[PDB]
């Protein structure tokens, strides 16, 4: 049913579930904005595929041909199913809108799944090529900050700074993040163009002329030379196409904004720890397209997990 | 079946289940009134979608056309399924109530799901944009109160007050909560208007004239020029529409009352802790549209979880 | 199948399962008599909905119309399904028992689910508006009694009394319990009246006259002007209606007895603890409609859970 | 399938599973003979309901009417399904065996489920009205015996007796057990009588005369005045009825023997503990219809669970 399909792809952690794996220590290796874009760009095409051909919205089969009244049921069943297979054969289907529009109508669910998988590949590549490096690095910095905070409490009663300085002049990981977003934006635009073209097709194009004339039936003057067939699940296609087109148009600026890594990050995420006597070093140097920008974005995204940071955040917020 | 569908969306934690996630410490980041509104505004449209087209209430298919007796089964099957697809084509369906009412009848389950997802978006946005900030902040205040209470017991045998004062002059989080409720109210009103319009449609409008006359059949004087078709699952639509309309009308004041954040909160939630010698500070300053109002509402909502508060509540309640 | 549906709603904890939630400490916040009433008032309507339209008891579809022998299968399928949709259209169905009885027959499963959900709302409201307050309060009194008993053992080798005195003059929670039972009784009576009216309908009323005469078919003298249709799953409806009517009649006095909160409670539930030297205070003052009556009923319901009470119960029972 | 249905209700803990609930401490609150009677009296009617209408044993639908050859498929489908609904209408079905036998044949699965639920009610009442009292009491006596045994070992290197004496003169719980068995026996006898009457019905009674003559068809001389219909799934009914009848006849003496509570119990279950110097008191006084008899039966049923009893049992068994 439509409602329970909606519960499967929406209202539940379809792919936004936390990585319940005993190697990440409960961390998240994809940002909230990236997770939202991936879930929407994947969940929607799969949801529309399910909704287009679900029950309670579609009657009968996909295609139906008007066979003559003298045909039996099996002869008409042959005609209907022949013309469904007689879409990829040029010497047939004398349609008034060309051969391409009928190709898209037959394989529209396949095309929706095609770029749904393509959109999911960069997130999958990021989780298997760069995410473990982020998890390994973040698992050390967070522990190091806890040790510094504990030592500061002992004192009251800069290895990370050197590490971050080294990572500034090594753009090995930021380029991978930029590329993954860039391919995701490109595939979204390609899907945006295709849906716009599909929605622009004339509605009076699903129907086409058909003829069972090949071999034996060719020299048998007992069947009509032209059959009227119609691809029925097409009006639903042109309704979900524009819905997916609108969402992708709205989602494209989000990916474009995500591309500007240095703009998103702020250069005071670790400024909270500069008041500790043990630290006593500057944690901010500059900005730009470098791995440090990616680390700051990742750190800021899940910095509240450690208990030490929140206590420092409260202490430095009392400035009234 | 209807009963087990009811068990799926009602009588169980469809979306009101606690966030069993190892990052919230068992806290709840959405209030009881907000959770109830979200569950009803989402569960009901999905329940009505399932009930409208479930078995044991619907016979046959969605549409049926009265083909002439001279037509075969496959010809009549073509006619019935053609006219189902011949609803989005203007040069057909000479209905007596216009083109729009047949559009709504065909895609009524789609429209119900459309604003069901739209109503769920603000709760989803709140849980991924502002809920972690609430969880991070509440996890520190509750621990701080426990430490103060433990220190008070040691003494017998104001960092939070400064923190709350700072949060009064920063309306960064309350505006997000107000906006999320405002969009939820707007979508409810939009759904309220649409259901009222749909229920106001004349019942003698699902049936429409149909004609298979396009291309080959156009110059073939063998089929009747007018077919009588009927959208059958329409009377059920106009029954669940008014049911959803009534609930949304009843649910609208709840969202309106939820909008008035300062009115809902009380300015003595932390007054219980003012008797401790270590605290010895005022926890109440004033009211208004500020983050402090949201924090007080969130704190009061789940203040009984900590064991320290209940003991203080019992101690201060003995005033007879 | 009927048997496995019975196992789903009966013979298992459909909604009487314990609240396996890490916030109640294994306590029960609804009494045995209230749980039994809620389970019966909810399980039975859902069971009857499943049994009425399950397989092995129903043949074919819900409605069948006697089409003339000259009609094809699809024409007869149109007639049967048209008249099923032609029940909510006044200018048709010239029945001999009126328009209302056919409305109830078509939507009888919907009506059964309607008050099944309505009956479940007060228990749901009680579990989300007053149950956490009971759990928070009972979790403190039971711990306090254990501490008093432990102190008494130390002595051998009245904060609660003051708390209960304060709760006597605050009828904030008992009114909510009285209201929830009152609405449950009202909905039961409303369901009792409806089932009695439905069972009183003449059995010779499911069948009705039908006519496919609207638009094109109106000026086409080829189809009969009157069709004989019958709502078939009606005799089963009038059998389960009286079964649900009998149970609700038997269940109504149970809710009425549950309303009398002061009568149910006994004023010696905490009298067992009065022998301890540390307690040495009276735990019983009077009765009436107050929160103390509700607390005593809740305490007595699950007082054997604590190990201290049972030992005191055995000690004070040796009076032969 | 039949085999997997058998695995569902037989060969598995359908309702004999242990109460996996964190409030019983692994104890069993229903005796082996009572559990066996409840499982058989419930599992068998549900098994027969599944087997009667399962696939691979039934062909087609429940009822079939011999329509004239001039009728179309839909007309014959109307006739077959009308007469299935035309069983609860007196002015029809001129059967040669009366109106009652056709009522039972149509609703035989409903009647099997009716007393299947009725038989399960006393066990359900016992588990929610008297079982927690037994669990609370048995959880204290067993712990007390362990403490006495531990103290006896310390001595080598009568609170329960007083408690049992008090429970002799309080028949508050035994009457509930006697009543539950008595209603179970009565319902078994009522089911025994009904099955005997149903099996005694003549096999030449499922078939009956039918007539679609009401309203429009009444003054239409085109259809035959008498249709021959047959309730087909009736011979299977009279086979499972006698099978259930035989089992209930065999099961009735077991319930009758279970009624004699004092006869079943033995007055030396706690005699094993009389050799301990700390105990040094008599644990046996007399017999009769009292709560002590029920406690002894419950204690003897699960006395081997405690490790102390088995060691005493071995020690006192060395008398050769
Ligand atoms: C484009 C929206 C389309 C909505 C219509 C839905 C389309 C159909 C549904 C389709 C399926 C529903 C998918 C559910 C959405 C996924 C969960 C959601 O995770 O994440 C929200 C985090 O919210 C944040 O924004 C994170 C914080 C960053 C703020 C800066 C934003 C920069 C611009
Ligand atoms: C385009 C070229 C062209 O104009 O020539 C067209 C012929 O060539 C074709 O047959 C078009 C083929 C369409 C491919 C379907 C992808 C299915 C995805 C599968 C995804 C599944 C992955 C899992 C005809 O040109 P025209 O219309 O006559 O010219 C106007
Ligand atoms: C960005 C949205 C922001 C608000 C979101 C929410 C509000 C609702 C949003 C969008 C409303 C829904 C789309 C309505 C468009 C009507 C088209 C129509 O009937 O005429 C068609 C002519 O063909 C065309 O018009 C050319 C292709 C149209 C491109 C898609 C339209 C969406 C804009 C995308 C903007 C990006 C550029 C007729 O042909 P047919 O019968 O379809 O076959
Ligand atoms: C509008 C009701 C519609 C009922 C009909 C149901 C419609 C159909 C069912 C549809 C589906 C059933 C959904 C079940 C409801 C969700 C669970 C429920 O959580 O929460 C209750 C918390 O109760 C509280 O009220 C919380 C305390 C705040 C008190 C101030 C109220 C301000 C006004
Ligand atoms: C309205 C404009 C108007 O009057 O012109 C109408 C034509 O225009 C139309 O065809 C109306 C389109 C209806 C859209 C259906 C939404 C499906 C949701 C999908 C949700 C799925 C998401 C998952 C006709 O005007 P009229 O009646 O002739 O005038 C009187
Ligand atoms: C707020 C409820 C509080 C109590 C709740 C519980 C009690 C039960 C509640 C509501 C009762 C159920 C609705 C009964 C309305 C009968 C309408 C009728 O037959 O005539 C129709 C005429 O068309 C119209 O009447 C115009 C549209 C009507 C708007 C919806 C009605 C609900 C009020 C919403 C109030 C908000 C404003 C005929 O046309 P048709 O055959 O329908 O096609
Ligand atoms: C009305 C009965 C209808 C029976 C027919 C069943 C109808 C069909 C079955 C329908 C579905 C079966 C539901 C199963 C019943 C729920 C479980 C059951 O919990 O609880 C029993 C607690 O037993 C108690 O009574 C608790 C102690 C209080 C004693 C004072 C009583 C005041 C009067
Ligand atoms: C009654 C008024 C009256 O007598 O006039 C009647 C007309 O009015 C009607 O059409 C009656 C409507 C019945 C409502 C069905 C509820 C479905 C529940 C949905 C629950 C689903 C929730 C999920 C006719 O009066 P009559 O018989 O001619 O007079 C004698
Ligand atoms: C409380 C039970 C205690 C024992 C429980 C267990 C024993 C079994 C219990 C009840 C036995 C089952 C009901 C038998 C009633 C026969 C009715 C009949 O055939 O004539 C009908 C006339 O119409 C009427 O008679 C008017 C409505 C009748 C109301 C419901 C009856 C139940 C009493 C409810 C008491 C509350 C007041 C004919 O019309 P039709 O063909 O039905 O259409
Ligand atoms: C009546 C038998 C019918 C058998 C045919 C089965 C009928 C069809 C199967 C139907 C379904 C199968 C149900 C399986 C049986 C339940 C499990 C079974 O628990 O318990 C056995 C404990 O055995 C004991 O007897 C316990 C010790 C007490 C001894 C004194 C007896 C007094 C007389
Ligand atoms: C008997 C009275 C009598 O002789 O008169 C009979 C008429 O009266 C009847 O119609 C009999 C009704 C049978 C009830 C079926 C129970 C379904 C259980 C539902 C359980 C579902 C619960 C879940 C006819 O007498 P006769 O045969 O003409 O006389 C010889
Ligand atoms: C207790 C068993 C111990 C051994 C168990 C294992 C051995 C196998 C056990 C039992 C064997 C199976 C039953 C065989 C009985 C044949 C009946 C027959 O064909 O004639 C029928 C005449 O009608 C009657 O005979 C009257 C009703 C008969 C009552 C049920 C019989 C079971 C005894 C129950 C004893 C309690 C009293 C003909 O009519 P029809 O075509 O049926 O319609």
PDB file of N, CA and C in Angstrom, chain A residues 61 63-67 72-73 76-77 80, chain B residues 72-79:
ATOM      1  N   UNK A  61      -2.928  -3.525 -16.573  1.00  0.00           N
ATOM      2  CA  UNK A  61      -1.527  -3.653 -16.932  1.00  0.00           C
ATOM      3  C   UNK A  61      -0.979  -2.313 -17.417  1.00  0.00           C
ATOM      4  N   UNK A  63       0.277  -1.591 -20.579  1.00  0.00           N
ATOM      5  CA  UNK A  63      -0.122  -1.273 -21.943  1.00  0.00           C
ATOM      6  C   UNK A  63      -1.376  -2.064 -22.290  1.00  0.00           C
ATOM      7  N   UNK A  64      -2.208  -1.475 -23.146  1.00  0.00           N
ATOM      8  CA  UNK A  64      -3.411  -2.130 -23.640  1.00  0.00           C
ATOM      9  C   UNK A  64      -3.622  -1.736 -25.092  1.00  0.00           C
ATOM     10  N   UNK A  65      -3.906  -2.722 -25.938  1.00  0.00           N
ATOM     11  CA  UNK A  65      -4.145  -2.502 -27.356  1.00  0.00           C
ATOM     12  C   UNK A  65      -5.584  -2.863 -27.693  1.00  0.00           C
ATOM     13  N   UNK A  66      -6.203  -2.061 -28.556  1.00  0.00           N
ATOM     14  CA  UNK A  66      -7.597  -2.272 -28.942  1.00  0.00           C
ATOM     15  C   UNK A  66      -7.631  -3.294 -30.070  1.00  0.00           C
ATOM     16  N   UNK A  67      -7.760  -4.559 -29.700  1.00  0.00           N
ATOM     17  CA  UNK A  67      -7.875  -5.630 -30.674  1.00  0.00           C
ATOM     18  C   UNK A  67      -9.276  -5.648 -31.283  1.00  0.00           C
ATOM     19  N   UNK A  72      -9.918 -13.619 -30.215  1.00  0.00           N
ATOM     20  CA  UNK A  72     -10.131 -14.286 -28.943  1.00  0.00           C
ATOM     21  C   UNK A  72      -9.328 -13.579 -27.853  1.00  0.00           C
ATOM     22  N   UNK A  73      -9.481 -14.046 -26.612  1.00  0.00           N
ATOM     23  CA  UNK A  73      -8.730 -13.453 -25.512  1.00  0.00           C
ATOM     24  C   UNK A  73      -7.231 -13.651 -25.696  1.00  0.00           C
ATOM     25  N   UNK A  76      -5.814 -11.423 -28.401  1.00  0.00           N
ATOM     26  CA  UNK A  76      -5.676 -10.058 -27.906  1.00  0.00           C
ATOM     27  C   UNK A  76      -4.560  -9.956 -26.877  1.00  0.00           C
ATOM     28  N   UNK A  77      -4.391 -10.990 -26.049  1.00  0.00           N
ATOM     29  CA  UNK A  77      -3.277 -11.007 -25.108  1.00  0.00           C
ATOM     30  C   UNK A  77      -1.944 -11.023 -25.841  1.00  0.00           C
ATOM     31  N   UNK A  80      -1.463  -7.354 -27.248  1.00  0.00           N
ATOM     32  CA  UNK A  80      -1.084  -6.393 -26.218  1.00  0.00           C
ATOM     33  C   UNK A  80       0.364  -6.589 -25.789  1.00  0.00           C
TER      34      UNK A  80
ATOM     35  N   UNK B  72     -15.494  -7.315 -26.887  1.00  0.00           N
ATOM     36  CA  UNK B  72     -14.896  -8.439 -26.187  1.00  0.00           C
ATOM     37  C   UNK B  72     -14.369  -7.978 -24.830  1.00  0.00           C
ATOM     38  N   UNK B  73     -13.851  -8.926 -24.047  1.00  0.00           N
ATOM     39  CA  UNK B  73     -13.295  -8.574 -22.745  1.00  0.00           C
ATOM     40  C   UNK B  73     -12.091  -7.651 -22.891  1.00  0.00           C
ATOM     41  N   UNK B  74     -11.184  -7.967 -23.817  1.00  0.00           N
ATOM     42  CA  UNK B  74      -9.974  -7.165 -23.964  1.00  0.00           C
ATOM     43  C   UNK B  74     -10.286  -5.776 -24.503  1.00  0.00           C
ATOM     44  N   UNK B  75     -11.274  -5.667 -25.393  1.00  0.00           N
ATOM     45  CA  UNK B  75     -11.695  -4.351 -25.859  1.00  0.00           C
ATOM     46  C   UNK B  75     -12.266  -3.522 -24.717  1.00  0.00           C
ATOM     47  N   UNK B  76     -13.092  -4.138 -23.869  1.00  0.00           N
ATOM     48  CA  UNK B  76     -13.626  -3.429 -22.713  1.00  0.00           C
ATOM     49  C   UNK B  76     -12.529  -3.113 -21.706  1.00  0.00           C
ATOM     50  N   UNK B  77     -11.561  -4.019 -21.549  1.00  0.00           N
ATOM     51  CA  UNK B  77     -10.424  -3.739 -20.680  1.00  0.00           C
ATOM     52  C   UNK B  77      -9.614  -2.561 -21.203  1.00  0.00           C
ATOM     53  N   UNK B  78      -9.461  -2.465 -22.525  1.00  0.00           N
ATOM     54  CA  UNK B  78      -8.804  -1.300 -23.108  1.00  0.00           C
ATOM     55  C   UNK B  78      -9.590  -0.028 -22.825  1.00  0.00           C
ATOM     56  N   UNK B  79     -10.915  -0.080 -22.979  1.00  0.00           N
ATOM     57  CA  UNK B  79     -11.739   1.111 -22.785  1.00  0.00           C
ATOM     58  C   UNK B  79     -11.664   1.585 -21.340  1.00  0.00           C
TER      59      UNK B  79
END
